[PDB]
Enzyme design. Structure first.
Site, PDB file in Angstrom:
ATOM      1  N   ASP B  25       0.814  -1.209   0.000  1.00 58.48           N
ATOM      2  CA  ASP B  25       0.000   0.000   0.000  1.00 58.48           C
ATOM      3  C   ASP B  25       0.853   1.266   0.000  1.00 58.48           C
ATOM      4  OD1 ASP B  25      -1.943   1.917   0.247  1.00 58.48           O
ATOM      5  OD2 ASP B  25      -2.866   1.032   2.078  1.00 58.48           O
ATOM      6  N   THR B  26       0.964   1.874  -1.187  1.00 56.14           N
ATOM      7  CA  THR B  26       1.738   3.105  -1.339  1.00 56.14           C
ATOM      8  C   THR B  26       1.075   4.306  -0.677  1.00 56.14           C
ATOM      9  OG1 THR B  26       0.698   3.548  -3.498  1.00 56.14           O
ATOM     10  CG2 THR B  26       2.771   2.281  -3.452  1.00 56.14           C
ATOM     11  N   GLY B  27      -0.223   4.224  -0.377  1.00 56.94           N
ATOM     12  CA  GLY B  27      -0.895   5.264   0.364  1.00 56.94           C
ATOM     13  C   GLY B  27      -0.733   5.195   1.870  1.00 56.94           C
TER      14      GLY B  27
HETATM   15  C1  LIG Z   1     -12.319  -5.709   5.252  1.00 51.80           C
HETATM   16  C2  LIG Z   1     -12.321  -4.366   4.583  1.00 51.80           C
HETATM   17  O1  LIG Z   1     -13.113  -3.555   5.339  1.00 51.80           O
HETATM   18  P1  LIG Z   1     -13.426  -2.088   4.831  1.00 51.80           P
HETATM   19  O2  LIG Z   1     -13.993  -2.074   3.541  1.00 51.80           O
HETATM   20  C3  LIG Z   1     -11.783  -1.193   4.855  1.00 51.80           C
HETATM   21  O3  LIG Z   1     -10.752  -2.012   4.445  1.00 51.80           O
HETATM   22  C4  LIG Z   1      -9.560  -1.235   4.222  1.00 51.80           C
HETATM   23  C5  LIG Z   1      -9.030  -0.193   5.141  1.00 51.80           C
HETATM   24  C6  LIG Z   1      -7.746   0.552   4.787  1.00 51.80           C
HETATM   25  C7  LIG Z   1      -6.991   0.271   3.471  1.00 51.80           C
HETATM   26  C8  LIG Z   1      -5.727   1.048   3.098  1.00 51.80           C
HETATM   27  C9  LIG Z   1      -6.217   2.455   2.734  1.00 51.80           C
HETATM   28  N1  LIG Z   1      -7.234   2.332   1.731  1.00 51.80           N
HETATM   29  C10 LIG Z   1      -8.513   3.022   1.764  1.00 51.80           C
HETATM   30  O4  LIG Z   1      -8.947   3.619   2.650  1.00 51.80           O
HETATM   31  O5  LIG Z   1      -9.195   2.866   0.548  1.00 51.80           O
HETATM   32  C11 LIG Z   1     -10.598   3.250   0.438  1.00 51.80           C
HETATM   33  C12 LIG Z   1     -10.829   3.755  -0.704  1.00 51.80           C
HETATM   34  O6  LIG Z   1     -10.997   2.487  -1.699  1.00 51.80           O
HETATM   35  C13 LIG Z   1     -11.539   1.568  -1.015  1.00 51.80           C
HETATM   36  O7  LIG Z   1     -10.755   0.224  -1.078  1.00 51.80           O
HETATM   37  C14 LIG Z   1     -10.223  -0.101   0.027  1.00 51.80           C
HETATM   38  C15 LIG Z   1     -10.858   0.913   1.097  1.00 51.80           C
HETATM   39  C16 LIG Z   1     -11.441   1.954   0.442  1.00 51.80           C
HETATM   40  C17 LIG Z   1      -5.084   3.312   2.202  1.00 51.80           C
HETATM   41  O8  LIG Z   1      -4.487   2.641   1.212  1.00 51.80           O
HETATM   42  C18 LIG Z   1      -4.097   3.638   3.355  1.00 51.80           C
HETATM   43  N2  LIG Z   1      -4.762   4.562   4.264  1.00 51.80           N
HETATM   44  C19 LIG Z   1      -4.323   5.932   4.229  1.00 51.80           C
HETATM   45  C20 LIG Z   1      -5.090   6.702   3.094  1.00 51.80           C
HETATM   46  C21 LIG Z   1      -4.463   8.126   2.977  1.00 51.80           C
HETATM   47  C22 LIG Z   1      -6.579   6.796   3.411  1.00 51.80           C
HETATM   48  S1  LIG Z   1      -5.033   3.927   5.803  1.00 51.80           S
HETATM   49  O9  LIG Z   1      -5.274   2.384   5.785  1.00 51.80           O
HETATM   50  O10 LIG Z   1      -6.162   4.774   6.345  1.00 51.80           O
HETATM   51  C23 LIG Z   1      -3.540   4.166   6.699  1.00 51.80           C
HETATM   52  C24 LIG Z   1      -2.502   3.095   6.652  1.00 51.80           C
HETATM   53  C25 LIG Z   1      -1.246   3.346   7.443  1.00 51.80           C
HETATM   54  C26 LIG Z   1      -1.041   4.688   8.163  1.00 51.80           C
HETATM   55  N3  LIG Z   1       0.126   5.186   8.999  1.00 51.80           N
HETATM   56  C27 LIG Z   1      -0.256   6.468   9.499  1.00 51.80           C
HETATM   57  S2  LIG Z   1      -1.628   6.867   9.058  1.00 51.80           S
HETATM   58  C28 LIG Z   1      -2.065   5.695   8.218  1.00 51.80           C
HETATM   59  C29 LIG Z   1      -3.349   5.448   7.433  1.00 51.80           C
HETATM   60  C30 LIG Z   1      -7.521  -0.741   2.547  1.00 51.80           C
HETATM   61  C31 LIG Z   1      -8.789  -1.473   2.964  1.00 51.80           C
HETATM   62  O11 LIG Z   1     -14.366  -1.255   5.791  1.00 51.80           O
HETATM   63  C32 LIG Z   1     -14.417  -1.696   7.125  1.00 51.80           C
HETATM   64  C33 LIG Z   1     -15.310  -0.734   7.893  1.00 51.80           C
END
Ligand SMILES: CCOP(=O)(COc1ccc(C[C@H](NC(=O)O[C@H]2CO[C@H]3OCC[C@H]32)[C@H](O)CN(CC(C)C)S(=O)(=O)c2ccc3ncsc3c2)cc1)OCC
Lengths: 99, 99
Positions: B25-27
């Site tokens: 995860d590059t984000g």
């Molecule tokens: C079982 C699944 O359950 P679920 O659906 C949720 O799963 C998930 C949850 C999180 C991720 C990774 C994040 N992706 C995301 O938010 O993507 C959304 C948009 O597209 C959709 O696809 C996937 C989700 C939807 C990002 O890549 C990374 N993030 C930062 C960015 C800037 C927001 S981070 O994780 O917040 C994070 C990580 C390390 C870190 N260190 C300091 S801060 C900090 C913050 C993938 C899947 O809901 C449950 C209620």
């Protein structure tokens, strides 16, 4: 280009005619931008992230240019902490990960 | 290898003696893993994303093997929905974005 990851992979995008900064995010299935005015019809949607679910506006078949690469696809607009470009558009510009 | 983004970039990792699937995860600035009882000292921390924050435990100098490539750094453990490999470790295996 080849983008290393020592700093956040931030790029300039053009959408609805305006320039914005956005994060290339391989962990996002979908593209999510901060609140903005976009022309076109939209529908309510929900998306979940690390901390729970948010309400977004789903705009379909939107033009967006990412470092001079054109994509046309779904853009979600809502209270995301940062503008993120997800895999739905990364695939259109031919992005891959390599190590 | 080269990893396309048609599907979520899930890979096998080895951590604390166990095998897991995790998202490249590059984000993600930092690496966040599902609840596990790692030995050693840790510090509480809060990390935020879409939907808000979660409480995690921060472990330092933890070794992870990612598809055979080794990395050592900070790992955050908490109720994340998925295991996330962040830039702090991706840089160490020399992972880049290419389009
Ligand atoms: C079982 C699944 O359950 P679920 O659906 C949720 O799963 C998930 C949850 C999180 C991720 C990774 C994040 N992706 C995301 O938010 O993507 C959304 C948009 O597209 C959709 O696809 C996937 C989700 C939807 C990002 O890549 C990374 N993030 C930062 C960015 C800037 C927001 S981070 O994780 O917040 C994070 C990580 C390390 C870190 N260190 C300091 S801060 C900090 C913050 C993938 C899947 O809901 C449950 C209620």
């Amino acid at each position: 280009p080849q983008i290393t990851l020592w700093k956040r992979p931030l790029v300039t995008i053009k959408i609805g005619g305006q320039l914005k900064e956005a994060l290339l995010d391989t962990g996002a299935d979908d593209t999510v931008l901060e609140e903005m005015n976009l022309p076109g019809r939209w529908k309510p949607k929900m998306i979940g992230g690390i901390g729970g679910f948010i309400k977004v506006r789903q705009y379909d078949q939107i033009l967006i240019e990412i470092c001079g690469h054109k994509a046309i696809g779904t853009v979600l607009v809502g209270p995301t902490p940062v503008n993120i470009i997800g895999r739905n558009l990364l695939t259109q510009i031919g992005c891959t990960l390599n190590f």
